[PDB]
A and B are shown apart, each in its own frame.
Chain A
Amino acid sequence: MVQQLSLFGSIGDDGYDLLISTLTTISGNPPLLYNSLCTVWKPNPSYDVENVNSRNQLVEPNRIKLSKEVPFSYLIDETMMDKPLNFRILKSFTNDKIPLNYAMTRNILHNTESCSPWSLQISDIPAAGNNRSVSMQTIAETIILSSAGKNSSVSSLMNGLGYVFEFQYLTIGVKFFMKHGLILELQKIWQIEEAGNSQITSGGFLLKAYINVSRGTDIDRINYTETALMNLKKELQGYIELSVPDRQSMDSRVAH
């Protein structure tokens, strides 16, 4: 039952290298290029559901997401094999042009036997208590390891659990593992659609500084991670501003 103590921000494309150097000086760790193709599944509109659950507590339907990596050979467009996989490759990715397309993501989802590992993440709206200076969100996640059968595609498995595909996005970025377990990611996001890819983070990089805590009941750990985040904020003042994003923005519930 993890809690993400998180702050958010944004930079332009011109200040990306400056922020990379600054965070390298802060942490002592080089940035780490990463990707995660996140596929989002909403409950089936043809299925009549009940607002109640197995117990007597009434809940909203929620989009549940599946995330996994894509190999970078599938993101290299046969023109940049020579440059190594580092933070410098994110300057080329500014427009909507991404080699990973809707046909190949559909091929990945439909597995056209055994399936690749996935991470199933379910997240509610962040906490409404206006006394925490950082955004606290609750995420429950499993690791889907393998699959088999004549109906082994992960999309049809999600249909069997009752969720249909809604949208998917590929995020590519660099992260820092700085002092005392704070993960700061800096990423671009593209939405993968049959009509064509679209750069959601248009002309800039999105910043997410988060800490994962296994027990959100541990108030001492919550306060320690929060004051680590504010220490990072104080260290980053003057250059970039860290602020709490909207809970309506971070809510993943299905509206009706």
Chain B
Amino acid sequence: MQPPYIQERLKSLNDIETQLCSMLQEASQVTFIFGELKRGNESVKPQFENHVKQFYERLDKSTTQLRKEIQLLDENVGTRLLPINVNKKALGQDTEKMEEQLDLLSAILDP
């Protein structure tokens, strides 16, 4: 329907937005855990370390994925994107609707 490359880039960008959404959840959890360990709890210290680590690796993977998404967008400016900014034209609709009235006329002639 759409090209599979367009599908893959859409899913990659949606995944990027999902990681950037969960970025705020991870930051909230890190501030929470820092909250009770400043209150005085000490048993949650490895959870603090793991949450900060997963926050930073999510940032790294999302930023590198977005970097190579911009790289692919700039690279495909000649392969499958327009090198200039211009509105496209609707073509072939006369041929398609000729085909559909030929189909309709054949259907009415031959039951």
Question: B-contacting residues of A (Cβ < 8 Å)?
Answer: 15, 18, 22, 24-28, 235-239
Question: In the complex, which residues of chain B have a beta carbon less than 8 angstroms from the beta carbon of A15?
Answer: 78
Q: Could you tell me if A238 and B83 are in contact, using CB atoms closer than 8 angstroms?
A: yes
Q: Could you tell me if B84 and A238 are in contact, using CB atoms closer than 8 angstroms?
A: yes
Q: Could you tell me if B91 and A18 are in contact, using CB atoms closer than 8 angstroms?
A: no
Q: Could you tell me if A239 and B91 are in contact, using CB atoms closer than 8 angstroms?
A: no
**8 A Cβ contacts from B49-81 to A:** 78
Q: Could you tell me if A22 and B89 are in contact, using CB atoms closer than 8 angstroms?
A: no
Contact of A28 among B78, B83, B89 (CB under 8 A): B89
Q: How far is the CB of B80 from chain A (nearest CB, A)?
A: 10
- Complex Cα–Cα for A25 and B91 (A): 10
Of the listed residues A18, A27, A238, the one surrounded by the most CB atoms of chain B closer than 10 A to its CB is A18
Q: Could you tell me if A239 and B84 are in contact, using CB atoms closer than 8 angstroms?
A: yes
Q: How many residues of B contact A (CB 8 A)?
A: 8
Question: In the complex, which residues of chain A have a beta carbon less than 8 angstroms from the beta carbon of B88?
Answer: 25
Q: Does B24 touch A at the CB level, under 8 Å?
A: no
The secondary structure that dominates the A interface is helix
Q: Could you tell me if A235 and B83 are in contact, using CB atoms closer than 8 angstroms?
A: no
**8 A Cβ contacts from B64-111 to A:** 78, 82-84, 86, 88-89, 91
Q: Could you tell me if B86 and A28 are in contact, using CB atoms closer than 8 angstroms?
A: no
Which residue from chain B places its CB closest to the CB of A238 in the assembled complex? B84
- Complex Cα–Cα for A237 and B84 (A): 8
Question: In the complex, which residues of chain A have a beta carbon less than 8 angstroms from the beta carbon of B82?
Answer: 22, 25
- Top 4 closest pairs, chain A to chain B, by CB: A239-B83, A28-B89, A25-B88, A239-B84
Q: How far is the CB of A255 from chain B (nearest CB, A)?
A: 40
Q: Could you tell me if A235 and B78 are in contact, using CB atoms closer than 8 angstroms?
A: no
Question: In the complex, which residues of chain A have a beta carbon less than 8 angstroms from the beta carbon of B84?
Answer: 22, 235-239
Question: In the complex, which residues of chain A have a beta carbon less than 8 angstroms from the beta carbon of B83?
Answer: 18, 22, 238-239
Q: How far is the CB of B38 from chain A (nearest CB, A)?
A: 55
Q: Could you tell me if B86 and A25 are in contact, using CB atoms closer than 8 angstroms?
A: yes
- Complex Cα–Cα for A97 and B91 (A): 36
Q: How far is the CB of B74 from chain A (nearest CB, A)?
A: 13
Question: In the complex, which residues of chain B have a beta carbon less than 8 angstroms from the beta carbon of A237?
Answer: 84
Which residue from chain B places its CB closest to the CB of A28 in the assembled complex? B89
